[PDB]
Amino acid sequence: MVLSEGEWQLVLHVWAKVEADVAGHGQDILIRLFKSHPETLEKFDRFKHLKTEAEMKASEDLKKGGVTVLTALGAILKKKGHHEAELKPLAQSHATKHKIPIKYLEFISEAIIHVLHSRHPGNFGADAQGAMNKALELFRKDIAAKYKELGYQG
Ligand code: HEM
């Protein structure tokens, strides 16, 4: 698929807001993913044991991990689709080492959209949410095809 330049503009304009506080956005986003789909917390051997939102809010590794996720996602969105090299290493550890089904990437994509909608209502209107949904579906589609090449899922 392919995003038009104006859709990439809408995506990178919200993202530029998220970047003003990458760690608080990553915390929000992972906590929302783990509240909504608790099974996903199990994939994290270093947090797995956190029992409440309060413990999550208080954990520095969880905050470190959100920052890692968002920074890697922001570097892929800024390529505007030419992200082949950035996805290769990524698709290799998630398929072979961590073992994150595509289903799990769809869930987090949901949690990202939820959080941006809450924090950025003025910059996250329907059109911008459509463009971000599109950019994220494009991410998942290219990752799923890499997974297939590596021997996972597909
Ligand atoms: C937008 C989606 C994602 C991006 C771009 C992303 C990115 C990354 C990156 C850059 C790392 C560190 C380097 C490496 O291990 O590859 C990481 C590690 C990891 N990711 Fe992902 N990831 C995402 C989604 C997921 C999801 C949805 C889950 C699972 C329920 C997941 C679970 C993990 C785990 C378990 C690690 C290891 C944590 C640790 O022990 O340090 N990832 N992720």
Side-chain angles (χ1 to χ4, degrees):
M1 35 197 286
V2 188
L3 268 73
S4 70
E5 177 64 38
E7 285 173 313
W8 276 125
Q9 284 195 103
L10 285 157
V11 162
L12 292 176
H13 172 73
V14 226
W15 207 258
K17 305 302 185 195
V18 165
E19 291 194 307
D21 182 8
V22 181
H25 283 84
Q27 277 177 296
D28 276 5
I29 294 170
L30 288 181
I31 287 165
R32 132 111 325 190
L33 166 76
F34 302 145
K35 282 220 302 243
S36 293
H37 304 282
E39 64 272 18
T40 54
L41 176 58
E42 282 182 79
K43 289 284 147 164
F44 289 85
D45 262 55
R46 76 180 319 149
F47 323 138
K48 220 150 97 178
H49 54 317
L50 313 154
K51 311 182 175 276
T52 69
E53 187 175 354
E55 287 180 10
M56 302 186 190
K57 245 99 118 21
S59 146
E60 204 77 17
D61 292 308
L62 189 153
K63 168 137 99 8
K64 287 180 260 199
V67 162
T68 298
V69 168
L70 293 193
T71 306
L73 183 58
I76 280 143
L77 292 169
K78 280 155 201 194
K79 301 300 306 290
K80 290 165 42 174
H82 298 89
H83 56 236
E84 320 66 29
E86 288 76 359
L87 253 47
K88 269 186 186 177
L90 212 248
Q92 177 171 48
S93 54
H94 284 63
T96 322
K97 163 87 205 233
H98 316 313
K99 279 132 201 151
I100 312 311
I102 297 276
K103 183 63 134 136
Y104 283 16
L105 303 188
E106 271 169 5
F107 291 166
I108 202 171
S109 288
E110 188 170 316
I112 283 167
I113 282 167
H114 177 89
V115 175
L116 297 222
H117 167 91
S118 312
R119 288 204 179 196
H120 309 289
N123 283 311
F124 210 52
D127 287 344
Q129 172 167 343
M132 179 63 87
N133 166 60
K134 213 169 150 177
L136 291 173
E137 297 189 353
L138 170 65
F139 165 62
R140 271 194 262 154
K141 155 164 84 45
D142 282 17
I143 261 250
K146 292 20 146 172
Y147 277 8
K148 237 216 157 261
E149 284 179 50
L150 300 163
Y152 177 59
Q153 283 196 116

